[PDB]
């Protein structure tokens, strides 16, 4: 779930406040819906969104609270990186990675203030 993907970004970026730095950044990380990414970091939120859609349709996700915004998957963060640990649920397993991928993308990927609060595309 949201809360979890948050801690993920933290595990891979000690010091930062997700809800604070990565919120309202570029176009595809604040709301999603302007066209044309603007950063190698922003480039990967759109990947995150597209990733949730892929997951919100996935055959293996059915139950109640299976949506990617409310899905509490299994994973861990151990002194360095975070590796998912859900096998049985090829659904919850798929989600984590959407979050593990971006959470790890952001890490390397550069952040450049110059873009935080834009205006339009």
Which domains occur in the chain, in start order? 1-121 (1.20.90.10)
What was the structure determination method?
X-ray
Resolution (angstroms) stands at: 2.7
Do 16 and 83 meet the contact criterion of CB atoms below 8 Å apart?
no
The C-alpha atoms of residue 118 and residue 75 are separated, in whole angstroms, by 34
Q: Is 48 a catalytic residue?
A: yes
Q: Is 58 a catalytic residue?
A: no
Sign of the C-alpha dihedral, residues 48, 50, 53, 57? negative
Rg (CA), the chain: 14
Which candidate in 42, 48, 58, 119 is catalytic? Answer: 48
Which candidate in 39, 42, 79, 99 is catalytic? Answer: 99
In 1-121, where does DSSP find H-type helix? Answer: 2-11, 18-21, 43-55, 92-108
The C-alpha atoms of residue 121 and residue 117 are separated, in whole angstroms, by 11
Contacts 24+ apart (CB under 8 A), 84-88: none
DSSP-based three-state secondary structure for 65: coil
């Amino acid at each position: 779930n949201l809360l979890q993907f948050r801690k993920m970004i933290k595990c891979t970026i000690p010091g930062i406040e997700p809800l604070l730095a990565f919120s309202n950044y570029g176009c595809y990380c604040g709301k999603g819906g302007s066209g044309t990414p603007v950063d190698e970091l922003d480039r990967c939120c759109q990947t995150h969104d597209y990733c949730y859609d892929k997951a919100k349709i996935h055959p293996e996700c059915r139950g109640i609270l299976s949506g990617p915004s409310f899905n509490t998957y299994a994973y861990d963060c151990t002194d360095g990186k975070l590796t998912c640990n859900d096998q049985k649920d090829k659904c919850k397993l798929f989600i984590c990675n959407c979050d593990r991928t971006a959470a790890m993308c952001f890490a390397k990927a550069p952040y450049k203030e110059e873009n935080n609060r834009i205006d339009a595309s």
